[PDB]
Protein backbone atom coordinates (compact mmCIF):
# COMPACT_ATOMS: atom_id res chain seq x y z
CA UNK A 1 0.00 0.00 0.00
CA UNK A 2 1.31 3.49 -0.80
CA UNK A 3 0.13 7.04 -0.32
CA UNK A 4 0.42 9.58 -3.15
CA UNK A 5 2.66 12.60 -2.74
CA UNK A 6 0.79 15.32 -0.90
CA UNK A 7 -0.62 18.35 -2.69
CA UNK A 8 2.05 20.93 -3.37
CA UNK A 9 2.47 23.80 -0.98
CA UNK A 10 5.17 25.69 -2.86
CA UNK A 11 5.72 26.19 -6.57
CA UNK A 12 7.65 29.16 -8.01
CA UNK A 13 5.70 28.77 -11.26
CA UNK A 14 2.38 29.51 -9.61
CA UNK A 15 1.24 33.12 -9.38
CA UNK A 16 0.49 34.37 -5.92
CA UNK A 17 0.00 37.46 -3.85
CA UNK A 18 -1.24 38.59 -0.49
CA UNK A 19 -4.74 40.03 -0.15
CA UNK A 20 -6.63 41.13 2.95
CA UNK A 21 -9.10 38.36 2.16
CA UNK A 22 -6.35 35.74 2.23
CA UNK A 23 -5.15 37.20 5.52
CA UNK A 24 -8.67 36.70 6.92
CA UNK A 25 -8.71 33.14 5.58
CA UNK A 26 -5.62 32.43 7.67
CA UNK A 27 -6.21 34.46 10.80
CA UNK A 28 -9.96 33.84 11.12
CA UNK A 29 -11.09 30.90 9.03
CA UNK A 30 -8.20 28.45 9.20
CA UNK A 31 -7.39 29.28 12.81
CA UNK A 32 -11.02 28.73 13.88
CA UNK A 33 -11.32 25.37 12.19
CA UNK A 34 -7.83 24.24 13.22
CA UNK A 35 -8.50 24.52 16.95
CA UNK A 36 -11.90 22.82 16.82
CA UNK A 37 -12.18 19.51 18.74
CA UNK A 38 -13.02 17.76 15.44
CA UNK A 39 -10.16 19.22 13.39
CA UNK A 40 -7.57 16.49 13.94
CA UNK A 41 -8.55 14.11 11.06
CA UNK A 42 -8.25 17.04 8.68
CA UNK A 43 -4.94 18.48 9.89
CA UNK A 44 -2.85 16.37 7.50
CA UNK A 45 -3.32 14.26 4.38
CA UNK A 46 -5.26 11.03 4.77
CA UNK A 47 -2.73 8.26 5.44
CA UNK A 48 -4.52 5.55 3.54
CA UNK A 49 -1.77 3.04 4.37
CA UNK A 50 -1.97 3.36 8.16
CA UNK A 51 -5.76 3.75 8.12
CA UNK A 52 -6.09 0.67 5.86
CA UNK A 53 -8.13 2.47 3.23
CA UNK A 54 -6.62 1.10 -0.01
CA UNK A 55 -9.50 2.44 -2.09
CA UNK A 56 -9.25 6.00 -0.70
CA UNK A 57 -7.04 7.42 -3.44
CA UNK A 58 -8.99 5.48 -6.06
CA UNK A 59 -12.19 7.38 -5.12
CA UNK A 60 -10.60 10.66 -4.02
CA UNK A 61 -8.57 11.96 -6.94
CA UNK A 62 -8.24 15.57 -5.70
CA UNK A 63 -7.16 15.17 -2.08
CA UNK A 64 -7.06 18.16 0.22
CA UNK A 65 -6.59 18.74 3.91
CA UNK A 66 -6.14 21.66 6.28
CA UNK A 67 -2.45 20.94 6.84
CA UNK A 68 -1.95 21.65 3.15
CA UNK A 69 -4.20 24.68 3.27
CA UNK A 70 -2.39 26.05 6.32
CA UNK A 71 0.98 25.72 4.58
CA UNK A 72 -0.40 27.28 1.40
CA UNK A 73 -1.67 30.25 3.41
CA UNK A 74 1.54 30.60 5.42
CA UNK A 75 3.56 30.36 2.20
CA UNK A 76 1.31 32.87 0.40
CA UNK A 77 0.67 30.25 -2.31
CA UNK A 78 -2.69 31.59 -3.42
CA UNK A 79 -3.60 34.33 -5.86
CA UNK A 80 -7.09 34.92 -4.47
CA UNK A 81 -9.58 33.91 -1.81
CA UNK A 82 -11.55 31.77 -4.23
CA UNK A 83 -8.61 29.39 -4.70
CA UNK A 84 -8.39 28.84 -0.95
CA UNK A 85 -12.16 28.56 -0.46
CA UNK A 86 -12.13 25.93 -3.19
CA UNK A 87 -9.52 23.93 -1.28
CA UNK A 88 -11.73 23.92 1.83
CA UNK A 89 -14.73 22.86 -0.23
CA UNK A 90 -12.71 20.07 -1.84
CA UNK A 91 -11.68 18.80 1.57
CA UNK A 92 -15.27 18.67 2.85
CA UNK A 93 -16.66 17.19 -0.37
CA UNK A 94 -14.01 14.47 -0.39
CA UNK A 95 -15.06 13.42 3.09
CA UNK A 96 -18.71 13.21 2.03
CA UNK A 97 -17.84 11.36 -1.18
CA UNK A 98 -15.75 8.70 0.56
CA UNK A 99 -17.83 8.17 3.71
CA UNK A 100 -21.44 7.41 4.61
CA UNK A 101 -24.07 9.80 6.01
CA UNK A 102 -24.07 9.77 9.78
CA UNK A 103 -20.56 8.41 10.04
CA UNK A 104 -18.50 10.07 12.78
CA UNK A 105 -16.08 11.58 10.31
CA UNK A 106 -18.99 13.09 8.35
CA UNK A 107 -20.44 14.59 11.54
CA UNK A 108 -16.99 16.05 12.21
CA UNK A 109 -16.73 17.51 8.75
CA UNK A 110 -20.23 18.97 9.08
CA UNK A 111 -19.30 20.72 12.33
CA UNK A 112 -16.22 22.22 10.75
CA UNK A 113 -18.10 23.16 7.59
CA UNK A 114 -20.74 25.01 9.62
CA UNK A 115 -18.01 27.13 11.19
CA UNK A 116 -16.36 27.62 7.82
CA UNK A 117 -19.61 28.93 6.36
CA UNK A 118 -20.16 31.25 9.33
CA UNK A 119 -16.69 32.72 8.93
CA UNK A 120 -16.62 33.07 5.14
CA UNK A 121 -19.98 34.85 5.33
CA UNK A 122 -17.96 37.80 6.68
CA UNK A 123 -15.05 37.70 4.27
CA UNK A 124 -13.96 41.36 4.02
CA UNK A 125 -14.21 43.44 0.88
CA UNK A 126 -10.90 43.40 -0.98
CA UNK A 127 -8.73 46.43 -0.15
C1 LIG B 1 -6.60 10.41 10.80
C2 LIG B 1 -7.94 10.10 10.18
S1 LIG B 1 -8.31 10.91 8.57
C3 LIG B 1 -9.94 10.13 8.58
C4 LIG B 1 -10.02 9.40 9.65
C5 LIG B 1 -9.01 9.37 10.47
C6 LIG B 1 -8.92 8.56 11.78
C7 LIG B 1 -11.27 8.60 9.92
C8 LIG B 1 -12.07 8.81 11.19
C9 LIG B 1 -12.97 7.94 11.61
C10 LIG B 1 -13.72 8.21 12.90
C11 LIG B 1 -13.45 9.31 13.58
CL1 LIG B 1 -14.19 9.68 15.13
C12 LIG B 1 -12.42 10.29 13.13
C13 LIG B 1 -11.77 10.04 12.01
N1 LIG B 1 -12.20 8.26 8.88
C14 LIG B 1 -11.61 8.00 7.56
C15 LIG B 1 -12.48 7.07 6.76
C16 LIG B 1 -12.34 5.66 7.34
O1 LIG B 1 -11.43 5.33 8.06
N2 LIG B 1 -13.36 4.72 6.92
C17 LIG B 1 -13.38 3.30 7.34
C18 LIG B 1 -13.94 3.16 8.76
C19 LIG B 1 -14.03 1.96 9.33
C20 LIG B 1 -14.56 1.85 10.72
C21 LIG B 1 -14.93 2.91 11.36
C22 LIG B 1 -14.82 4.29 10.69
N3 LIG B 1 -14.36 4.39 9.49
C23 LIG B 1 -11.53 9.34 6.90
N4 LIG B 1 -12.17 9.81 5.86
N5 LIG B 1 -11.82 11.18 5.67
C24 LIG B 1 -10.96 11.44 6.66
C25 LIG B 1 -10.28 12.81 6.84
N6 LIG B 1 -10.75 10.34 7.44
UniProtKB/Swiss-Prot annotation:
Distribution of this protein across tissues and organs: Ubiquitously expressed.
Coiled-coil residue windows: none
Subcellular location: Nucleus; Chromosome
Crosslinked residue numbers (Glycyl lysine isopeptide (Lys-Gly) (interchain with G-Cter in SUMO2)): 58
Note: JQ1, a thieno-triazolo-1,4-diazepine derivative, and I-BET, a benzodiazepine derivative, have been tested on tumors with success. Treatment with GSK1210151A (I-BET151, a I-BET derivative) has strong effets on mixed lineage leukemia and promotes myeloid differentiation and leukemia stem-cell depletion.
Assembly and oligomerization: Interacts with p53/TP53; the interaction is direct. Interacts (via CTD region) with CDK9 and CCNT1, acting as an associated component of P-TEFb complex. Interacts with RELA (when acetylated at 'Lys-310'). Interacts (via NET domain) with NSD3, CHD4, BICRA and ATAD5. The interaction with BICRA bridges BRD4 to the GBAF complex. Interacts (via NET domain) with JMJD6 (via JmjC and N-terminal domains); the interaction is stronger in presence of ssRNA and recruits JMJD6 on distal enhancers. Interacts with NSD3. Interacts with NIPBL. (Microbial infection) Interacts with bovine papillomavirus type 1 regulatory protein E2. This interactions may serve for the tethering of viral genomes to host mitotic chromosomes allowing successful partitioning of the viral genome during cell division.
Annotated protein name in UniProt: Bromodomain-containing protein 4
Natural source organism: Homo sapiens (Human)
Highest classification ranks of the organism: Eukaryota, Metazoa, Chordata, Craniata, Vertebrata
Gene: BRD4
Amino acid sequence: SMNPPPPETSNPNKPKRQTNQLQYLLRVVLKTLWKHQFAWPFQQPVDAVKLNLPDYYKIIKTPMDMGTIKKRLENNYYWNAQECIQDFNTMFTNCYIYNKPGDDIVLMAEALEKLFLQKINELPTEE
